[PDB]
DNA sequence: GAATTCGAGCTCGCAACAATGAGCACAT
DNA sequence: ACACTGCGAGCTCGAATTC
């Protein structure tokens with residue numbers, strides 16, 4: 001049972017890892033999807049942990065070896081069409097996503113400059129307190 | 135605040151102003167829960183264990199709350215080192231409906247769980263925080 | 264009526280995560 | 292084809308007295 005080509009098949013690379021009825025003949029390696037890791041689904045499409053495992057339907061992942069560790073731990077992989085379908089479900093339209101990213105991408109450079117004034121107001125407080133008194 | 139036995143449905147959002155005006159014209163509002171027979175709520179298995187013996191000043195405060203076999207919304211002022219929390223668990227053990235405990239701090243909700251496990255015989259799947 | 268001081272809570276981002284040892288019970 | 296549990300940041304209140 002499929003939906004893209006409608007063929008009857010027992011199992012494929014999909015529908016046992018992501019629950020998607022898609023045959024393994026074409027498989028669309030760079031056509032319909034890619035394999036996006038977990039850390040790219042948090043900083044690009046801006047989803048918290050309450051979006052990948054609590055919003056119905058909860059989507060699952062694939063564990064694999066870490067590329068630059070080889071003895072340490074995991075590397076989770078998600079299906080790319082399942083992420084951008086979830087980002088449209090959590091954040092209204094697609095033209096609300098990047099517009100929310102502009103006010104977020106300025107908050108780190110706001111932290112970059114507000115770190116540099118508390119470093120001024122504290123180091124100048126140590127020398128102004130010695131001259132104000134008498 | 136709108137929308138023998140004459141009744142009219144009042145609005146939930148301004149139940150505070152209705153209690154202000156009902157005292158303002160000397161026909162006050164009572165909150166006597168008649169909990170022995172309501173037939174809507176699923177009475178849970180909260181039961182006071184026979185280890186929490188309550189002192190005679192706590193037995194006098196609960197006697198004024200559950201007066202005629204019907205619970206009453208009031209304020210009980212006991213000292214903190216005194217049994218201020220055991221009267222709370224015993225009042226939840228007597229109405230035996232869905233309690234809801236509120237505290238001021240996140241440390242205070244870590245204690246009410248530790249008092250409901252000491253004197254009330256509840257599983258860990260029902261004392262949620 | 265609009266500030267303060269010091270406290271509280273809830274959201275949420277930030278940065279970087281680890282995993283080292285040794286033996287007798289049950290079938291024809 | 293990276294990344295778990297902890298933790299100070301804003302934000303908004305509170306009590307009581309201030310400016």
Ligand SMILES: [Zn+2]
Nearest residue numbers: 002004005023
């Ligand atoms: Zn297909």
